[PDB]
Amino acid sequence: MTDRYSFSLTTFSPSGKLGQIDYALTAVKQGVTSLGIKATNGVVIATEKKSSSPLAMSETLSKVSLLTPDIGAVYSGMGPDYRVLVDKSRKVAHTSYKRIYGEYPPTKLLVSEVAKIMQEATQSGGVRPFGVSLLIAGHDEFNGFSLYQVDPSGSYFPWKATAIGKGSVAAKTFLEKRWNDELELEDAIHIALLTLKESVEGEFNGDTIELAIIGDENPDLLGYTGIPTDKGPRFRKLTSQEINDRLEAL
Amino acid sequence: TTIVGVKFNNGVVIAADTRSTQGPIVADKNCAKLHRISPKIWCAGAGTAADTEAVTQLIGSNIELHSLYTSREPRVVSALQMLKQHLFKYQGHIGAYLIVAGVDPTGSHLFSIHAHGSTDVGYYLSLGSGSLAAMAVLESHWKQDLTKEEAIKLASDAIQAGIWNDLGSGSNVDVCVMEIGKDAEYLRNYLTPNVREEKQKSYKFPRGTTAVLKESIVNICDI
Amino acid sequence: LKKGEVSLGTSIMAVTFKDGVILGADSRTTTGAYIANRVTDKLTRVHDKIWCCRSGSAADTQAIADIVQYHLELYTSQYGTPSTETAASVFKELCYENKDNLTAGIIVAGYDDKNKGEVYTIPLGGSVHKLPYAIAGSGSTFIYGYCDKNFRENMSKEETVDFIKHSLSQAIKWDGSSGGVIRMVVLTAAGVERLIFYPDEYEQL
Amino acid sequence: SDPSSINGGIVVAMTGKDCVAIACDLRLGSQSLGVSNKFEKIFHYGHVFLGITGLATDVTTLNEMFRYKTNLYKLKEERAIEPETFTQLVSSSLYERRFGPYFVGPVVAGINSKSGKPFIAGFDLIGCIDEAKDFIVSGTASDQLFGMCESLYEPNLEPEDLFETISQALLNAADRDALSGWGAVVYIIKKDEVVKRYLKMRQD
Amino acid sequence: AGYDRHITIFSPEGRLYQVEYAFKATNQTNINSLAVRGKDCTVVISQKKVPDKLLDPTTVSYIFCISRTIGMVVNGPIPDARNAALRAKAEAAEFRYKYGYDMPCDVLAKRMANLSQIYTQRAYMRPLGVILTFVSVDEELGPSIYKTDPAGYYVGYKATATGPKQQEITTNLENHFKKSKIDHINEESWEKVVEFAITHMIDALGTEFSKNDLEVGVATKDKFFTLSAENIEERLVAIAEQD
Amino acid sequence: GSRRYDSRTTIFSPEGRLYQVEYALESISHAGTAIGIMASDGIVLAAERKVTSTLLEQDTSTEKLYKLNDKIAVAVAGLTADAEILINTARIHAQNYLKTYNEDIPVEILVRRLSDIKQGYTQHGGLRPFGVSFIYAGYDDRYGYQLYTSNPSGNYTGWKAISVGANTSAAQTLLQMDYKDDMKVDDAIELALKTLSKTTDSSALTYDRLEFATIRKGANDGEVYQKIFKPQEIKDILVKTGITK
Amino acid sequence: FRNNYDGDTVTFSPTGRLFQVEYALEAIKQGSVTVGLRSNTHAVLVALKRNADELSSYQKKIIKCDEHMGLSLAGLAPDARVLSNYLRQQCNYSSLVFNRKLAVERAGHLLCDKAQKNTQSYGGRPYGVGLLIIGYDKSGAHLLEFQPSGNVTELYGTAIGARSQGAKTYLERTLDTFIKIDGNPDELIKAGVEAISQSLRDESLTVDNLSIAIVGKDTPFTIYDGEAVAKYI
Amino acid sequence: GTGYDLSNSVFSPDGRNFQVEYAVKAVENGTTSIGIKCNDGVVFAVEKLITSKLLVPQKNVKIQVVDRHIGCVYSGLIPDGRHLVNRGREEAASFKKLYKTPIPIPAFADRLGQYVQAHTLYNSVRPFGVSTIFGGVDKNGAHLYMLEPSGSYWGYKGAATGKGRQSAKAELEKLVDHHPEGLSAREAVKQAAKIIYLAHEDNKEKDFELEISWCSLSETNGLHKFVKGDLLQEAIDFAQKEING
């Protein structure tokens, strides 16, 4: 006889601060380096895949997930929180914008559902916030290319470049200098790889590096070369071999 | 309509005609009867227009949700089972006669589904109003050592038999080749073989016989 | 029923002999008078040693057997391997509880090594009845005399295949909702043998 | 009484070049007795026009549902809905109301204001999606109306010429009915000016 | 709130006490385990200690057969091990009916993970401390070894070990793998894989095992079986005559 | 024990205040400033965008300015995250009056539904209250322009000029002097900006540390046009009033 | 410390039992004293009823639960009502469903489960009232002791209430005598009065105080209250 | 203190919470039960303490049936023990209806097992203070299992719980080893009586009544019966020849 509990696990403090949220801000800091660059001409997201036994593999791990075909997401914070959140987020996006619509969700609108979920878990006791902050990078035809940031509270903000994970401020500061105005998507990949090189040390391989762009949708990414019937992915992960070429080219 | 599915030793062809009728009068020369579920699981549907399309989108959604969840290809047998459990709950209220086809890493497959709730596995299957005339062609000319060119060519012949002898069928024929080895080909309007119901010509209207009681203008606006 | 006319071969049996049980059926679905399927599976696996022969209406039977497959996958996993009689109970529950909307005539046929083969017949209404052999479908009535004299406790494997091969080929000959290949499933300690005989073969023998 | 033919109504839509046109009667009846010469069966939310014919109680309840859906969506996305998006929104709402006992024939009309296409699309009692762009008809006299449109209509027309077509096509189909008198309106739509022309026609 | 010693929430150090202590005791059954993959097969070798002679060994298992093809090794305390086994076996059975297809190692893994992370938030319900090693010989990707930990974390392996002598086993495995530069043993026939595994175990825990001290389960194409005592004895015998 | 995890912080104090409520009032003073000026010709809304990077974009000026309806908009002082939950429920509240009676919602009602909900959470459910204040800008033809504010205690009041956020007191003191019974929108635009410059917790003032909207009568319809000025359109206006610096 | 293990009912302590169970047990004794005795053909309960005042009067605490079944309480009146209501529903169902008069053994086990269940919550509580449940069915007369802990023992004589032991030792003496007085309503009543007096040491034995209840071989559940116990004193 | 003396809602560094530790104790303050597995059966035996002369024999027995072939005996707290068998009975009855079979002994063990595990992952649901030894004969053979407060179970050849658990197991492993398993069901009753005797020395302050039962394939024919009459008296007598403590 149980399920009578609903007293909150997130309370106000005497500085009007929120206890769990302070705790969770650390969790993000103890993560690994992930970045985003919007080139206007696309979006590039990259992270370090790292793993917790030498016998494990990080080639068979993933830290970018497809949320819907044309949108991919990445995080800094704790692995468990990220997996349950991605699943719930994938569920609402299908149900409410492809059974009520048929066009894949505009990006910002998808951000608002992820944000609502995370805040909902903060209001209500017997659940606690998710301990993670996302950069959800997408494309939509009526927005163009987009980049959003979701904070662990549930708060959002747009950015045209940002960085998260260890040495967050300093990584972001580096982007400001190396990239101004509008430059290419290609060129921004070259930059993103360098920026990710300076954060990390002791791994430099393309089997521990994952870089993906949202920047093209080919029949090759459509799974059929016939006449289109849906938009299909605009998400594309660049190969371990592909990553390796570009490190040499810095 | 006439919907068919034909197995070859390298892939599967489904095909359909795209004519929607209200009486003998042709409402639509084009509406897809071939619906995409995932890039390589295509489904043909016959019967009542509204029902086949809606069910196919619900399943279509649940399968894509599945594919992302497992980080693996979707199986044809998942789509099959979702379809069966949906018909069963609603006890026949869904009136979808479906031909579900797919290619996976497990091989090429061909099944059909009645609204009545029974599924079958076949080497070739057909459904529709053109079902009798087409299934006749397909059983006779199907052979061992079937190939791509032979499977398209047979598939054209099928739809055509149903056009000719069911005169509620007609209009363009859309074909979809799904190969295990190479990226599937949706062939919109692969044949353009029949036309619109009868016209006699029409001509300009004199303005001493068309009169206006009053008129205004107005404008579209959005805040 | 569920919706419309779905019909199957309507002649199934399971027969016991020296090594186990052989179950046989003919395979053919028709939807009205249109031949929905030449060759199908009416010999349905619900466990590796426990199969069934399905009769009644094709749709109804398929929903019900799906559910069976689900309960015994779970029974096996938690509570260990099930009896023919146990498989038979799940069938019965469904048939009885849904007699007012579905019609399912099931012969549940199983091989065990510690009680030999067992044959359990499930009525349309849902009941559990033990026999040394059963015939069901509605063409079972014309071979009732045949089956009852030429069934014997203890026979060879070749010979049981003749008895079942002879029985059903007569049923398919008088019956009009039957045809296509003959399937059999031999559940023995020699494994699971699946037998197929094609139209030309059973007619002749 | 009748399922949808208590008050009657018929609706016609046509395609042209950077214009479409959508036209309706103004009848409301109570059985075969025509009661009113005004009843507007076409509504619009911005540059998407929705005509729904059939029983008036059912056209009204739907019209308020789509107004709601569109308003709240407009508010979130900070822009209007598109013809193409609205057709999706309609299919699903209607498939939700197939199980309910509605008796409607919607037809969707608009011009895309950043893709630059005329757009018309159709819907039925069952609520199935009809992709065609030539003419789509719906209502009581839909049978007479297809016969007429299919001969009278000719592809790709300037607004003036689209007017002559739609007007006469409706007027002559309507004259073989008593459930489609009591006045009529025609709307000629471009995405930056709309002309409303009232016609003068028969009643009982 | 104001509590973290009676309920479970985020730490400000960031290392959650309940998750850490769950990492720690699991070893209260006196187990050490590994699983490796062969080219065609996946073998588990696992310790057994019998603490009484009022106990039969043959009801003592740490491998539970989920389906027909899927195996699971639980390293934990046995009331918690079994609790997970009951839940896993039904979810597997439910999936198989619904989707027409036998459950993936990774999907089982992921689903139990997401649930444990849910119980970690819950303030009225505790998380199981179980470490679950899901193995099979899938034909849609070959041999697979996927390990979960109670946190909600799971990741793919080349071979794995669990127990306090995790490091020692790790080294034995790292050495072999560096040398061949392969992430599997390519030995045709399962047999030669089981024996090799057994050698490396004898090195790590540094003791010779008996039939009643190992329990060996092997996963094969489309079928999973645990190996018997008499067979286990054949393995120990045959390596005594290589030197 | 279930109640042996409870702390009951949702109850009245020995001072008769509600702990969690008082803490929410604090929150609002650490978030940006929001100012509402109602004139009888328009309503001018500003809300202050704090922490502005150059890699934060300036193509968005809807992220604390939200249209709740096509005649009602708010400026948020608080979190994006608290607000969003209530914002969706407001928008819905709009559609209900609209569908039933076929006309625009009154402001005074719509405000009450939000406040009652805030009030609800601290009475019952064991919940936290939302840490958010809204300044409501809306129009009716029964009252002209109306301007309200609601705050974390579930108390709401009407104002004809109001400030919320950091340095509320100081802004208000300046507001009280420069206010005059006579109004125009363009006069109100100058007024807002003069004040905004003097309340910033950073030297001078720049256009990007502002978010802006005006409510004028018509500009593409008969009346009641809400225009949300984007960052660059704000930049132009800071020169126009003559606060070029 | 103390407040840990009183303030929760879904706890246990190092002794092998929670403190709340020790207090509930104490509470039975805080009841007024009542004895129960049987020879296994008839069963009698003899009970000393106290009333608060000279200006109060006696209210019932021997409860007909059926015309063949009853109970006496000792302990908490509020709780006793809750339990009595339960036993009464239970008696009724037993008659309707099985044609049974209900054995004590079956009733006790069912009362146990409910009690257990309310220690499986916060804001449920043990009853803290004990009952001597008697009835005459087909295995004869029966006397049970129910405790709100869930301990069910059938005893041939017993007592609950303050100074249980006084009657209990008298009962262990007179045992062999009473069990061979079989078939007598009047000999057993006389015994009950004699018994209850070995409990007493700070209370008076008076007509109006005392109350007798019987069920037995040829007696359906009949109570002697007030006046009608004078002739057994 | 550590906070886990009154919570089941969190993880403890002993691998298990203190309140589960407290329930184990309660098992040790009950009165001795054993279980003897045989080559054709199983034997159950229990000590019931006699304190008072008022008790009646074999109606206050702590041996309870489930079905008609499954024997359950426990040591520790009485209310927890009755609750436990009462749940087992419902779930067994559910099994019997659903699969039309008698329950397996390994199946019954799980059915209890999940219910006992469930109230250790929940703070609001009280652990069992009983250890229950159970088994019977079934269609897989005969089986003896014993279930702990933990949710721990394993298959036994002999099993014990209660005050004299140590002493009893010591005598039992010796006899079970010296024989193949404690020979046949008849032999085992005399041995069982001797264990109940030896065990009484750990309790020799109060008297006992020896109460024995069986379910044996070859000497009760698939049913559970209590062992009584001539045979029970005979067994006490046999014990009093050899042991004379």
Side-chain angles (χ1 to χ4, degrees), chain C residues 45-48 63 65-70 72-74 76-78, chain E residues 65-68 82 86-87 89-90 92-98 102:
Chain C
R45 186 173 69 186
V46 298
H47 191 280
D48 288 346
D66 288 346
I67 293 169
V68 171
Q69 290 175 343
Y70 178 79
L72 295 175
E73 183 176 1
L74 181 60
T76 298
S77 66
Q78 295 179 341
Chain E
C65 181
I66 292 168
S67 66
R68 293 175 175 83
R82 178 65 182 85
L86 178 61
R87 289 180 183 275
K89 290 179 180 178
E94 182 179 30
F95 178 79
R96 178 66 182 85
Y97 180 78
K98 183 175 180 180
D102 187 82

Side-chain angles (χ1 to χ4, degrees), chain G residues 11 113 116 119 154 156-157, chain H residues 6 54 56 60 80 86 126:
Chain G
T11 191
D113 288 346
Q116 184 66 55
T119 61
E154 183 179 13
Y156 291 99
Chain H
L6 297 174
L54 297 176
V56 60
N60 292 285
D80 289 346
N86 186 63
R126 291 180 67 184

Side-chain angles (χ1 to χ4, degrees), chain A residues 138-202:
Chain A
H139 186 75
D140 195 87
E141 293 297 341
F142 294 104
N143 292 319
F145 292 100
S146 65
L147 179 66
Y148 298 91
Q149 183 177 328
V150 179
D151 292 339
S153 65
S155 296
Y156 66 93
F157 300 89
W159 300 83
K160 69 182 181 182
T162 189
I164 61 172
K166 184 177 180 181
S168 179
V169 173
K172 181 176 174 64
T173 298
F174 286 171
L175 292 173
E176 182 177 1
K177 182 176 180 180
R178 291 191 295 273
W179 181 82
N180 293 282
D181 298 325
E182 295 180 56
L183 300 174
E184 184 178 3
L185 178 61
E186 290 295 308
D187 191 62
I189 292 168
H190 289 152
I191 293 169
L193 291 173
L194 179 60
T195 298
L196 182 60
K197 182 177 179 180
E198 293 179 356
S199 66
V200 299
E201 184 177 0

Side-chain angles (χ1 to χ4, degrees), chain H residues 160-179:
Chain H
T161 187
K163 290 181 182 296
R165 182 178 178 179
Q166 187 276 329
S167 294
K169 290 180 179 178
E171 182 64 20
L172 179 60
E173 182 177 334
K174 181 178 179 180
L175 291 173
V176 171
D177 290 345
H178 182 72
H179 295 296

Side-chain angles (χ1 to χ4, degrees), chain G residues 186-202:
Chain G
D186 288 346
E187 291 296 308
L188 291 173
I189 292 168
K190 289 189 289 185
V193 173
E194 290 177 350
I196 198 168
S197 67
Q198 299 298 300
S199 180
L200 295 175
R201 292 181 183 274
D202 63 6

